[PDB]
Symmetry: C3
Subunit: 452 residues, 3 copies
Amino acid sequence: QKPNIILIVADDLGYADVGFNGSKDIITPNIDDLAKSGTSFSDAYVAHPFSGPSRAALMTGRYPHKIGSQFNLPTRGSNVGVPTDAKFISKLLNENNYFTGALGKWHMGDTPQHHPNKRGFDEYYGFLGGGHNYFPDQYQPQYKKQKAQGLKNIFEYITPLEHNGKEVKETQYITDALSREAVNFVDKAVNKKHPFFLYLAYNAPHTPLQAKDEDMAMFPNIKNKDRKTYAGMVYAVDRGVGKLVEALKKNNQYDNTLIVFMSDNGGKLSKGANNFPLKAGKGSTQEGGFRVPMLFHWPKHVPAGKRFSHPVSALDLYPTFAALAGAKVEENQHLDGTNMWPAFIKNENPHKDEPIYALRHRKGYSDAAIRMNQWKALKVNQQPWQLFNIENDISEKHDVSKSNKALLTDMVREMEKWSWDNQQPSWFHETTEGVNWRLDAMPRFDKTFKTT
Amino acid sequence: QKPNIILIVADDLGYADVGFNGSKDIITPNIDDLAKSGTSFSDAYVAHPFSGPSRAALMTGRYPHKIGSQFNLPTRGSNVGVPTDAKFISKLLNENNYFTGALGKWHMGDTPQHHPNKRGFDEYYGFLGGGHNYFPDQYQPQYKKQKAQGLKNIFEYITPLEHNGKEVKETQYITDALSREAVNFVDKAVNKKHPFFLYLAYNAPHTPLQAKDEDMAMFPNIKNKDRKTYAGMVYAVDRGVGKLVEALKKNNQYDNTLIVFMSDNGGKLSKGANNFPLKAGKGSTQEGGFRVPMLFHWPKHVPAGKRFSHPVSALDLYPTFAALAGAKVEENQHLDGTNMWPAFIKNENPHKDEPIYALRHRKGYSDAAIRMNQWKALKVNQQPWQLFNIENDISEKHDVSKSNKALLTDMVREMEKWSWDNQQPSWFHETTEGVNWRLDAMPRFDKTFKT
Amino acid sequence: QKPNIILIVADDLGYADVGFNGSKDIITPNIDDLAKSGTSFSDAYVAHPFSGPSRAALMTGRYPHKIGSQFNLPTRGSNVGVPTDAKFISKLLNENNYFTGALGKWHMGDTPQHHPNKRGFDEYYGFLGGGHNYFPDQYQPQYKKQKAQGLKNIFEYITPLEHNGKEVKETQYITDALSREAVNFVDKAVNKKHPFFLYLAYNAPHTPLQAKDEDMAMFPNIKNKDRKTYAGMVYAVDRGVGKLVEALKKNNQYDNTLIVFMSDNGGKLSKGANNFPLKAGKGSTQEGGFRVPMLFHWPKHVPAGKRFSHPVSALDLYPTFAALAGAKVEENQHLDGTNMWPAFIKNENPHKDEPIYALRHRKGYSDAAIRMNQWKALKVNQQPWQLFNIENDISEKHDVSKSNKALLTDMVREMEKWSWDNQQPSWFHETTEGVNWRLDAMPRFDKTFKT
Ligand SMILES: O=S(=O)(O)O[C@@H]1[C@H](O[C@H]2O[C@@H]3CO[C@H]([C@H]2O)[C@H]3O[C@@H]2O[C@H](CO)[C@H](OS(=O)(=O)O)[C@H](O[C@H]3O[C@@H]4CO[C@@H]([C@H]4O[C@@H]4O[C@H](CO)[C@H](OS(=O)(=O)O)[C@H](O[C@H]5O[C@@H]6CO[C@@H]([C@H]6O)[C@H]5O)[C@H]4O)[C@H]3OS(=O)(=O)O)[C@H]2O)[C@@H](O)[C@H](O)O[C@@H]1CO
Ligand SMILES: O=S(=O)(O)O[C@@H]1[C@H](O[C@H]2O[C@@H]3CO[C@H]([C@H]2O)[C@H]3O[C@@H]2O[C@H](CO)[C@H](OS(=O)(=O)O)[C@H](O[C@H]3O[C@@H]4CO[C@@H]([C@H]4O[C@@H]4O[C@H](CO)[C@H](OS(=O)(=O)O)[C@H](O[C@H]5O[C@@H]6CO[C@@H]([C@H]6O)[C@H]5O)[C@H]4O)[C@H]3OS(=O)(=O)O)[C@H]2O)[C@@H](O)[C@H](O)O[C@@H]1CO
Ligand SMILES: O=S(=O)(O)O[C@@H]1[C@H](O[C@H]2O[C@@H]3CO[C@H]([C@H]2O)[C@H]3O[C@@H]2O[C@H](CO)[C@H](OS(=O)(=O)O)[C@H](O[C@H]3O[C@@H]4CO[C@@H]([C@H]4O[C@@H]4O[C@H](CO)[C@H](OS(=O)(=O)O)[C@H](O[C@H]5O[C@@H]6CO[C@@H]([C@H]6O)[C@H]5O)[C@H]4O)[C@H]3OS(=O)(=O)O)[C@H]2O)[C@@H](O)[C@H](O)O[C@@H]1CO
Ligand SMILES: O=S(=O)(O)O[C@@H]1[C@H](O)[C@@H](O)[C@H](O[C@@H]2[C@@H]3OC[C@H]2O[C@H](O[C@@H]2[C@@H](O)[C@H](O[C@@H]4[C@@H]5OC[C@H]4O[C@H](O)[C@@H]5O)O[C@H](CO)[C@@H]2OS(=O)(=O)O)[C@@H]3OS(=O)(=O)O)O[C@@H]1CO
Ligand SMILES: O=S(=O)(O)O[C@@H]1[C@H](O[C@H]2O[C@@H]3CO[C@@H]([C@H]3O)[C@H]2OS(=O)(=O)O)[C@@H](O)[C@H](O)O[C@@H]1CO
Ligand SMILES: NC(=[NH2+])NCCC[C@H](N)C(=O)O
Ligand SMILES: NC(=[NH2+])NCCC[C@H](N)C(=O)O
Ligand SMILES: [Ca+2]
Ligand SMILES: [Ca+2]
Ligand SMILES: [Ca+2]
């Protein structure tokens, strides 16, 4: 019996904003249940410190730089997306007999060939862009007004949600709507004589900061307005996870389902998040930007009550899911992660003596990160490379590059070696960003990989 | 019975240079016959305001920017062309049982894999470059002299014409030569138990301005030397269309043949053309550069004596021809036009609430055009975006952008959205053009899509 | 019986550094034997004036610019290589029943899909980078020390050699080691009922200048330290050729084996080489950079004791080997050389009225070369195009461009035409080189093909 698989991804969820990863103010009982009876991950890294490229990496199992997807898609819409020649984990599972669903945020291409239904998902219910307004009673009138005015380029956050290409009129708070459709999906899966894969991509707690009064009422001792709204938004996700878990139990799916819960990137401190004890947040190559909460839950397979301390990459989920599903991986797919399960089961480092990378572009330069065993190499703000023993110095306070010159230089040269098959970006999130890229002769890797 | 299809394209034909589209001085009786007994199009647009990219769009059904073909091919020759992975309308029809011919101007690649015979044409008779000298007695001696001198890079306008890869020695005025081969092609098609597709690409009335004395004699009241030569050149095309039509009738092909006649782009005013009432001409994103004459003729299918007033794109011919031929279109072909026939038959707009675009690059900036319902948005000469109600203001005289700020902004943002899958050009028409493109960080779409 | 084929390539071997090509000080008796009983080539050209692109051209039969391989691979390692869609001569021969081996220097990609065993070589014994230190007793302790320190990016010149993906511990001087494995390969080939192809890629006489005392002792009258070391290194290659030849004779393979011996590029004057009488050396588009020593040896087929005076390209070896092996070449492979054997046998020019090109990129500009019949067109150091009658002026002393303006202009325009399907480089040898390429809007072919 092949297991069902559920990948739950929250959007801009801060490192300290779920109870199992150290939250003292936001309360996440249903998510914490999964942690307490499963394994959480203290050194879990996404492939990029923001949404689009991170999500591309999750789906393809490749660093987004390898497939021209290093930037978020154009904010006002486009006819491009994550390239079709990189087989999504969903398509691979669908080809090995899985019933497949995707819910909520896509952020990987609007067009027919980039649509969830052509990337291997039998079901899709959600919004295709970078986010969405949370209240239908707020957004539907705005959209109606603009459509009646003849406007064709409407802010994607107020546009109707869809189900398999057909527009719907959603009635509920979006987090709750997506949770309801998660229940509907796993309910539909009972009647199929097949295992299922569900990709549940919540837009919470991403902007705009919009919560239900009923969820905000549960945090009366949180005085800061943004933090209370944010706390409410996260609580809605927790309620949703509970509702999904309950449906899995009723359907007798729970015991044979691997649930993964994570964030797509680090939390944004100016929009209510907390990343303690990590430095900085969303978009950074500091730990706060791409080190995220993660838990696995699968009874009698994932040990209960444990805390896994070795590095794990979002890139690992593609080959790890494939191995558990009995799906063959071809070498021409160029997967950048590893099947982490053998090493996971022995409590060993699945990236022993192997680097994990982050490379985020800016105007005329790039910030970078290398995580390798106990070492974190850091390139930020055009300053020289820094080195931290991240196991003793999680907050990146003590640069020890002066005492380890050869090691750091070696780590950077390996990243330079790794960079040669990075593709030129196929798009940018804004027109001026792409113009500046060309004006500045990017990538300026002569600056990025300069050593000592 | 699947219909035969003939696409006749003239080269630099001005908007007012055929009788059915308002010519008062050039006379085009045989072309006008097709219009009078068919439907002409008052709002017909090509995909680019000059040859190579326009022709690539006709053949592929894709905006040339999508396939790296936004510029004319190198003037002195090259080993590149319209990419082989974009299936030509000719190949699609050939795969669905059509006998296929192409005549005259190619301008889409010289090399073996870019040659007409590898792009789905059973027959090809013509010249592969951007144009040709019209008189064999003039050009053949020039070529002979240069070949005997050992020169290998010879101006493509004097090089021998070819038939399916073998050089020929043409004897007649080129317009007449191509017309004769159109007759030969449809004559050969009688013996095949198949429908046929013919792509007749005349180089007239493109430069050099060379006409027969016999055709120029028919316009004694045209005093301007260039305009008289030009008029003659166009008259030769009209004679040719007549000869082709006559052959179709004799062969019992005429009633089951859809004939399309059009220009590849707007006329060039400094080389004898007239684009009245449109502003500017060849190469412009003003209407004069990419709005062209067009007619459909197909008895008992295309209504006789009509004038279709809704926008139509050259891009529409690919899926429209395919639907009529019963040829399936796969979604991975990424076609940018639409099958216009359903909407055409109901006299409705086949691009209702959908834009038609032109984007022509220049040195360090781009000019652009958007046609959407009654609206023409215009970006020219690095000035701010202008808006015209093109149905009331065909000559683009009255900028009404100040009264419609939100609408214009919306139209431009949609074009910006559309631009993201434009590919970097695979070539340029001159080396310095490509160098300047790279020096200037092109495309400078930050300037093109501002406000 | 299809013939066996051996391609022996030395690395940075100067033009005057083998006896048969005019050496007065370095003595190469075994290599000279092959010349004296075969044919040498006075006008043999590689496709690029340095290693990686030259080697890519040898293997693919294509100019390296056509396949994005105009630069050496990154010096400190990479996950890229000569593209997999360009079938190597080794794979073609392997598919037509040949037992295939490659020895020594690769310099065409480290990764699994770029590895010799996936590019059609049954056997590989060597080092995958741009070169190697010659003494195991010197390099193995350095590598051991650095590996134990935890370093993962180790200079490729001290890393272990490998045999079919498994690391080895080599005991001998590398030139001798590779010669020993050439003997082993042709010995293994006796037991196979198949012809064999062997690609023997010596790193000698490339840096570092490291020779055995026993080889240096043979040149007591060479006073210059570098020249003596270099002479020794070359003598080691000669000993190796002798050892291979002896094995071929013992195995009765010699008479049915075409042996080719050549250099990958011109010699480097600052590292012991001599290119007399050619101007300049390694990396240049002067003759000294890409005109190399070459000989063919094949008893009763290649005439004995001859000197072939017509141009021949490294690109020719792909289709020439294929024709002799009875292996079919598909037109979709886009081969840039020619099967030179028919013309070779008649003592005619296999590139009669056809150019041979060199195009080497630099910081913000490109140097170029055109060889066509008796003519050498030269573009160097950003100076204007020069023309030489290279048959009368091998040392490029007398620029005769003023007396042949039309001819030169024609040659350059043809090269400009040829350049349009050059691909943007897929990598560079250093990060700064790639940055400078983008900063300078390269290629600056406006400068390269001016006038
Ligand atoms: O009703 S309103 O909200 O008022 O108006 C809206 C709309 O605004 C909203 O749009 C979305 C939804 O909520 C907010 C709000 O502003 C906004 O949130 C954005 O959502 C995105 C997804 O839709 C995305 O989130 S993600 O998907 O999880 O990734 C956005 O995050 C990203 O934003 C950029 C793209 O990647 C990152 C960001 O990169 C920035 O790019 C800038 C250039 O454009 C700049 O780069 S640089 O110039 O090349 O250097 C910037 O760096 C700079 O930042 C400041 C300024 O200068 C310095 C520094 O001091 C420089 O470093 C760079 O960060 C990614 O964010 S990340 O945190 O960096 O990882 C997310 O913000 C309006 O947009 C619209 O006009 O109107 C509607 C109403 O109609
Ligand atoms: O024997 S001779 O005729 O005396 O000499 C010939 C030959 O000349 C001829 O070559 C052809 C045949 O007749 C004429 C003649 O000059 C010429 O006509 C050209 O035919 C082409 C096809 O072969 C093509 O027509 S098309 O196939 O229908 O498209 C040509 O039109 C195009 O020309 C350019 C390429 O696309 C468009 C043009 O783009 C121009 O490019 C310029 C850069 O090189 C420049 O761009 S910019 O530098 O980025 O700004 C230019 O813009 C500028 O132009 C002037 C100068 O400054 C302003 C403006 O005032 C600036 O805007 C840009 O337009 C397309 O033209 S379009 O009208 O824009 O659509 C067609 O001209 C000689 O060439 C040869 O050397 O010798 C032989 C005899 O041996
Ligand atoms: O122990 S040490 O030896 O001291 O140190 C070593 C190691 O150094 C060695 O590494 C190898 C082995 O011996 C030497 C030594 O320095 C070096 O040799 C090089 O081997 C390569 C293969 O491994 C390759 O040979 S080849 O495979 O046969 O091709 C090298 O030749 C090439 O080198 C460059 C790449 O292609 C050619 C060269 O191109 C150069 O590119 C430069 C940078 O971009 C520059 O280009 S430009 O700026 O754009 O114009 C350069 O031109 C310039 O050079 C100077 C400066 O400005 C002018 C000029 O005055 C400008 O023209 C251009 O040549 C090809 O050479 S070619 O001759 O041009 O064809 C071969 O040299 C160290 O590297 C390591 O770190 O340490 C170890 C010890 O630990
Ligand atoms: O760059 S160069 O130094 O190499 O050349 C320079 C200059 O830089 C170029 O910009 C310039 O280019 C013009 C245009 O293309 C080629 C050249 O002439 C073209 O027009 C000619 C036209 O003059 C000619 O007319 C002659 C004339 O009347 C009829 C005809 O024959 C008679 O004998 C008489 O002399 O006809 C040509 C076609 O046969 C051609 O006209 S056309 O084909 O373009 O319609 C172009 O001029 S244009 O862009 O103004 O139209 O050349 C100079 C070198 O002089
Ligand atoms: O969705 S939010 O970004 O959290 O907040 C917005 C709005 O702030 C925005 O207003 C414009 C558009 O982008 C920025 C600004 O230039 C953004 O502010 S910023 O992130 O601080 O730079 C906020 O003013 C309003 O109250 O709420 C909306 C969301 O509903
Ligand atoms: N159980 C293990 N695999 N431990 C080693 C993992 C790497 C470890 N962080 C180190 O100090 O090198
Ligand atoms: N004028 C001449 N063609 N001289 C002889 C040149 C010889 C040259 N190798 C050729 O093949 O042509
Ligand atoms: Ca996010
Ligand atoms: Ca034209
Ligand atoms: Ca070399």
